[PDB]
Tab-separated table of C-alpha atoms and ligand atoms in Angstrom:
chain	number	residue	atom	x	y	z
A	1	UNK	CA	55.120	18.648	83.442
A	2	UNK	CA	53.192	19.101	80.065
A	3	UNK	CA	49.613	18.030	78.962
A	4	UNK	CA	50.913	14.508	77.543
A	5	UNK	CA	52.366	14.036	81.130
A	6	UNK	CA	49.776	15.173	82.835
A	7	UNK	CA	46.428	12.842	81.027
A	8	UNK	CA	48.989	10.066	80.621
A	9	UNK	CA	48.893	10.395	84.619
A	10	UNK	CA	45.227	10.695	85.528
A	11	UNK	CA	44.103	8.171	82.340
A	12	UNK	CA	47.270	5.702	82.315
A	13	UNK	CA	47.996	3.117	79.564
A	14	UNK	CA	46.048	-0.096	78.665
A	15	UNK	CA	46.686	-2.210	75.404
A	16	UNK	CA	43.920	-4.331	75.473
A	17	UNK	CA	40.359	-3.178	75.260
A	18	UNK	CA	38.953	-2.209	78.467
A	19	UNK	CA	36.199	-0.871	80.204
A	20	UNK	CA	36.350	2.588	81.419
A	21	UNK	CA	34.965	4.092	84.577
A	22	UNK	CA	31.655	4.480	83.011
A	23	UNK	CA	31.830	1.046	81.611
A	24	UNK	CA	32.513	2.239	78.219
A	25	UNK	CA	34.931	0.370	75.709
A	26	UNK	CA	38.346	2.250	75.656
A	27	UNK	CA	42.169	1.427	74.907
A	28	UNK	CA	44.901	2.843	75.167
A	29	UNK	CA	45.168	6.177	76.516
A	30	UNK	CA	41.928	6.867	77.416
A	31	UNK	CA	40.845	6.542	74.095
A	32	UNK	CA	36.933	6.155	73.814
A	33	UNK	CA	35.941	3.592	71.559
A	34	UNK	CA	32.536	3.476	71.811
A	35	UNK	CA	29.492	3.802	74.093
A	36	UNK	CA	27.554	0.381	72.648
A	37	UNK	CA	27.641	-2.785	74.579
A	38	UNK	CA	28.861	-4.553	72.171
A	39	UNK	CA	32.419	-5.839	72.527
A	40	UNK	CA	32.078	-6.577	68.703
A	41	UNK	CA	31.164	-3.195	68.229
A	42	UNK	CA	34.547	-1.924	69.832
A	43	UNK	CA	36.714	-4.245	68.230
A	44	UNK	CA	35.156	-2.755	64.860
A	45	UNK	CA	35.850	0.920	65.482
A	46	UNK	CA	39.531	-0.041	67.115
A	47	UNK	CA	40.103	-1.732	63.755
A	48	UNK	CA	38.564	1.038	62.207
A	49	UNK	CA	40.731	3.595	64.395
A	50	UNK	CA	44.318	1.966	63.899
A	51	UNK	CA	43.397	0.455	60.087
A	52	UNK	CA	44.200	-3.142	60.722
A	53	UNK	CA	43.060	-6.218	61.980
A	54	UNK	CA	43.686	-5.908	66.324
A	55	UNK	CA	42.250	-8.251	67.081
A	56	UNK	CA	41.654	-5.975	70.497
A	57	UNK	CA	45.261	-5.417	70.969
A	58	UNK	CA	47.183	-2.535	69.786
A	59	UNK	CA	51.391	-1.808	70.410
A	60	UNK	CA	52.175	0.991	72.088
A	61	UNK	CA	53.290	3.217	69.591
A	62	UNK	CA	49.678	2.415	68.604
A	63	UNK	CA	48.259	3.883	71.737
A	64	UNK	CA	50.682	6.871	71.687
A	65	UNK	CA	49.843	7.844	68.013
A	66	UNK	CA	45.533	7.436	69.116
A	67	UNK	CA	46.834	9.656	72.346
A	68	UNK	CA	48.502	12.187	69.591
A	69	UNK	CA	45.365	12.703	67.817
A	70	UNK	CA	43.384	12.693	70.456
A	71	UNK	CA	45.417	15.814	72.609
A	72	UNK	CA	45.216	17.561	69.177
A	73	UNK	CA	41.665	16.719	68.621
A	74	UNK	CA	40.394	18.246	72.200
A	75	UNK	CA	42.664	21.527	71.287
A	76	UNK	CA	40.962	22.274	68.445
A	77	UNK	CA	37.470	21.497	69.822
A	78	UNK	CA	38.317	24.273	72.474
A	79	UNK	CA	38.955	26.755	69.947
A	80	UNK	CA	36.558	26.085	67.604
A	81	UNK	CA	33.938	26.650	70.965
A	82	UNK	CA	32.606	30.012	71.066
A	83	UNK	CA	32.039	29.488	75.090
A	84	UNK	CA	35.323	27.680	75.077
A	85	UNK	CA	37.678	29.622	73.231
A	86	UNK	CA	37.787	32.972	75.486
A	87	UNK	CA	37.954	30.854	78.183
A	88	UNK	CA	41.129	28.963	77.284
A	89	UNK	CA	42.420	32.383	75.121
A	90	UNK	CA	41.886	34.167	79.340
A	91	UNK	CA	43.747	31.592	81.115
A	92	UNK	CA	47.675	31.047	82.024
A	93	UNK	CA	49.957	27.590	80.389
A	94	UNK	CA	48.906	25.379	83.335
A	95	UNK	CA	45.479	26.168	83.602
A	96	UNK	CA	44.894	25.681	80.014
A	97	UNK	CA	46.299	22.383	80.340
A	98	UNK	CA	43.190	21.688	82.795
A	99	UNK	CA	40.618	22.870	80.734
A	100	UNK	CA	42.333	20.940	78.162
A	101	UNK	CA	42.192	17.338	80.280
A	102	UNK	CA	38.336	17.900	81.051
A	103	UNK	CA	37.842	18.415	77.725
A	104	UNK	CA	39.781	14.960	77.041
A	105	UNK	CA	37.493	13.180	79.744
A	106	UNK	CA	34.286	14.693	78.841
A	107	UNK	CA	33.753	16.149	75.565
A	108	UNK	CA	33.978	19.559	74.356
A	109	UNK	CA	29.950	19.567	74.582
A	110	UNK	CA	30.000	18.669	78.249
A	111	UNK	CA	32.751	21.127	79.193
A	112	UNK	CA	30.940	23.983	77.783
A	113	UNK	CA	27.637	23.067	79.829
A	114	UNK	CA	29.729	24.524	82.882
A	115	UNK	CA	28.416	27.753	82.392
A	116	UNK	CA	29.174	28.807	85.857
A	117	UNK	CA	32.214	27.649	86.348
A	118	UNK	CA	33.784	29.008	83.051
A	119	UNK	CA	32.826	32.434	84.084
A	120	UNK	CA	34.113	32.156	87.434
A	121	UNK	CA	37.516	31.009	85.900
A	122	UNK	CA	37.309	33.731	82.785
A	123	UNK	CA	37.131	36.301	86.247
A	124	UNK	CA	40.395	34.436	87.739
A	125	UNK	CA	38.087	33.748	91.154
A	126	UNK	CA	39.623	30.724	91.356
A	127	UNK	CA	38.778	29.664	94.447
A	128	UNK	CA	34.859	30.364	93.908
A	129	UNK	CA	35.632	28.186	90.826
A	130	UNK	CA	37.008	25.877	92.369
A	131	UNK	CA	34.061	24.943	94.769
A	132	UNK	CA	31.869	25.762	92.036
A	133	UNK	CA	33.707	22.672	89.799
A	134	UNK	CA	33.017	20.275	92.805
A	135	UNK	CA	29.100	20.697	92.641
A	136	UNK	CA	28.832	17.872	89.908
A	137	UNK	CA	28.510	14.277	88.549
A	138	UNK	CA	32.032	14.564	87.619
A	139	UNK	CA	33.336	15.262	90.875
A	140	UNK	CA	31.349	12.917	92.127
A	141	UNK	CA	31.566	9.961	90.103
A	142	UNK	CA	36.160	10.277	89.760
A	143	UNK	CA	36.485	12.598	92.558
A	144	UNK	CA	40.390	12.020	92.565
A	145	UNK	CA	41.130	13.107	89.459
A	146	UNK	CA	38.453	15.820	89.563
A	147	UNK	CA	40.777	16.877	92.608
A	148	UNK	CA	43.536	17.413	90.548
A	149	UNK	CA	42.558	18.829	87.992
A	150	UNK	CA	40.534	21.164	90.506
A	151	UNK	CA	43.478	21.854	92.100
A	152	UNK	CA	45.435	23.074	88.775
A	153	UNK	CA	42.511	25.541	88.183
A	154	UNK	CA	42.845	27.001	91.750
A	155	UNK	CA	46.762	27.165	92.398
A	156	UNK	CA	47.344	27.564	89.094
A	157	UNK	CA	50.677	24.644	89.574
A	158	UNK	CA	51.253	21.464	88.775
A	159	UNK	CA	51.764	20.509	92.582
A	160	UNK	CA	48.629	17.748	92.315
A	161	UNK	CA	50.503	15.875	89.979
A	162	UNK	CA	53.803	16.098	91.406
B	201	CL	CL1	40.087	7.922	65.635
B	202	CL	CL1	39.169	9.387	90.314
């Protein structure tokens, strides 16, 4: 199992535009278009993203290239994080891969507001982490794919995915 593997699981693949969990206009992998309600709007930055007229559809080596950019994208943010980057620099392959998915789902800004938890995981208590990750909107609001990812932080495997 590898990071691709992994998000490709928890965020699957969609070629049209769609609307994500939050309602948000997405495609592909996951990939955030933007947060306006305008379908107009999101059909602009997909052209924007993939430089031609969509039209609202993209192919999938469309999606996969977006997916690409976007794995390499959250990477970076993480080390370019001062909270972040001793975090991920502490941890082992798989759990780095976690950090790495929230990061995907929620931003590089909203990962690093889990004070708490990142210190918890930084002192490899994972189990205190662990309970400490569930306290939130964002186990609350995709609980089964919080779960997962939870459960990568605290066994430090790949067994949720498997
Ligand atoms: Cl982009
Ligand atoms: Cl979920």
């Amino acid at each position: 199992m590898n990071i691709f593997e992994m998000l490709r699981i928890d965020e699957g693949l969609r070629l049209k535009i769609y609307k994500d969990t939050e309602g948000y206009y997405t495609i592909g992998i996951g990939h955030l278009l933007t947060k306006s309600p305008s379908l107009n709007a999101a059909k602009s930055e997909l052209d924007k993203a993939i430089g031609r007229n969509t039209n609202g559809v993209i192919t999938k080596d469309e999606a996969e290239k977006l997916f690409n950019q976007d794995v390499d994208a959250a990477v970076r943010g993480i080390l370019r994080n001062a909270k972040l980057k001793p975090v991920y620099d502490s941890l082992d392959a798989v759990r780095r891969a976690a950090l790495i998915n929230m990061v995907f789902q929620m931003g590089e800004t909203g990962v690093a507001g889990f004070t708490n938890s990142l210190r918890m995981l930084q002192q490899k208590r994972w189990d205190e982490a662990a309970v400490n990750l569930a306290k939130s909107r964002w186990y609350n609001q995709t609980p089964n794919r919080a779960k997962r990812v939870i459960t990568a932080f605290r066994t430090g495997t790949w067994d949720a995915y498997k």
